[PDB]
Amino acid sequence: EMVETVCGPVPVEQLGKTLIHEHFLFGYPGFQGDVTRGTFREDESLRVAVEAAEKMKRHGIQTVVDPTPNDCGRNPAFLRRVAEETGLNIICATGYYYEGEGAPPYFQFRRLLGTAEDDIYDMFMAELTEGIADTGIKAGVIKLASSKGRITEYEKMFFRAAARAQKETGAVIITHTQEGTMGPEQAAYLLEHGADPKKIVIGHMCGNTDPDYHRKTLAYGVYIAFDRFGIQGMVGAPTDEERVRTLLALLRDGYEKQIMLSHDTVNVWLGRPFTLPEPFAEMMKNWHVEHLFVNIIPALKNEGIRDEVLEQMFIGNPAALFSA
Ligand SMILES: [Co+2]
Ligand SMILES: [Co+2]
């Protein structure tokens, strides 16, 4: 019936067209130490975020999940400003990034105390059921993440505590997979600690190009997201053409009730600005929150993909994901 958004509860029935994985702001852990030269210009970056949300609305999107980790610049109050100014629903998360590119020394120290997993559990409950900092905003998903080929010991604590917190709240889990690895293992590890696969999104499933690997993960009964459309070449990413071919194999198999699509945009980088070198810059060309609507879905349509399979993926799936 209801979901925690950054404006408070919203009926799941009103979510309609949803993107499952976009960032209004995002930073690599450490951006905070570079504050002098990488300042966070709020009004400029709110303007940008606001245009991003208008661009999504012009294509019928009524809800975005922003799964920005706690250690990657999550900022619920800033998202509430975006929601207030556009009427877009924005569901936010609680969780940390994977060990490779996250902030690990804090919870590694607590591991030595023996309190880490409960501490993380306790943080999931607080932010899911109470609110985040002095914000009054609750998280609507638990964000999880693993490394390349390994769900590390560190990562495993967050996974086990996420299973505990979901058993108690019925909360949704959205994960990160690194470079197309560990989708099946995440699904296995989660159900083995009792999590409910009807509330799990294994993410960046499109980073893997072998449909057997998709079907293996899909075998657990979980959702998968093809959520990096337009990310090409960078961070081991395959091409949009390889992603489309993969999604085709799975639509053909009838798996559309388990699949969701998004772009994983970062609309405002936290920290000091940068440019990509003209190789990669040109291959990253289409990484904007409109590419699904202008390029991706058209090409699906050309192939015979029917409107209602689309809808199943952008409407029916989010509805059911968030429903009890
Ligand atoms: Co990710
Ligand atoms: Co992301």
**HEC string for the chain:** CEEEEECEEEEHHHCCCEECCCEEEECCCCHHHHCCCCCCCHHHHHHHHHHHHHHHHCCCCCEEEECCCHHHCCCHHHHHHHHHHHCCEEEEEECCCCCCCCCCHHHHHHHHHCCHHHHHHHHHHHHHHHCCCCCCCCCCEEEEECCCCCCCHHHHHHHHHHHHHHHHHCCEEEEECCCCCCHHHHHHHHHCCCCCHHHEEECCHHHCCCHHHHHHHHCCCCEEEECCCCCCCHHHCCCHHHHHHHHHHHHHCCCHHHEEECCCCEEEECCCCCCCCHHHHHHCCCCCCCHHHHHHHHHHHCCCCCHHHHHHHHHHHHHHHHCC
Max alpha carbon distance in the chain (Å)? 57
177 CA → ligand 2 middle, Å: 10
304 CA → ligand 1 middle, Å: 30
56 CA → ligand 2 middle, Å: 17
The number of domains in the chain is: 1
Report whether 195 contacts 161 (CB < 8 A): no
**First-residue to last-residue Cα distance in the chain:** 7
65 CA → ligand 1 middle, Å: 12
User: What's the token pair of residue 67?
Assistant: 């799964």
276 CA → ligand 1 middle, Å: 19
Which experimental approach was used here? X-ray
- CATH number of residue 229's parent domain: 3.20.20.140
23 CA → ligand 2 middle, Å: 7
Distance CA 287, CA 295 (A): 11
At how many degrees (to 10) do helices 42-57 and 76-86 cross?
50
Report whether 24 contacts 267 (CB < 8 A): yes
Ligand nearest to the CA of 98: 1
Angle formed at CA 8 by CA 56 and CA 22, multiple of 5 degrees: 30
> Does 57 count as an annotated binding residue?
no
113 CA → ligand 2 middle, Å: 31
Distance CA 82, CA 145 (A): 26
Residue listed under structure tokens 């009926």 = 11
Amino acid at 270: L
Ligand nearest to the CA of 144: 1
Domain of residue 259 covers 1-324
> Does 59 count as an annotated binding residue?
no
> Does 143 count as an annotated binding residue?
yes
Tell me the torsion sign for CA atoms 54, 91, 62, 283.
positive
> Does 23 count as an annotated binding residue?
yes
The residues whose Cβ lies within 5 A of ligand 1, an ion, are 176
Report whether 17 contacts 314 (CB < 8 A): yes
Angle formed at CA 203 by CA 125 and CA 191, multiple of 5 degrees: 60
72 CA → ligand 2 middle, Å: 10
Distance CA 194, CA 166 (A): 9
> Does 204 count as an annotated binding residue?
yes
284 CA → ligand 2 middle, Å: 16
22 CA → ligand 2 middle, Å: 6
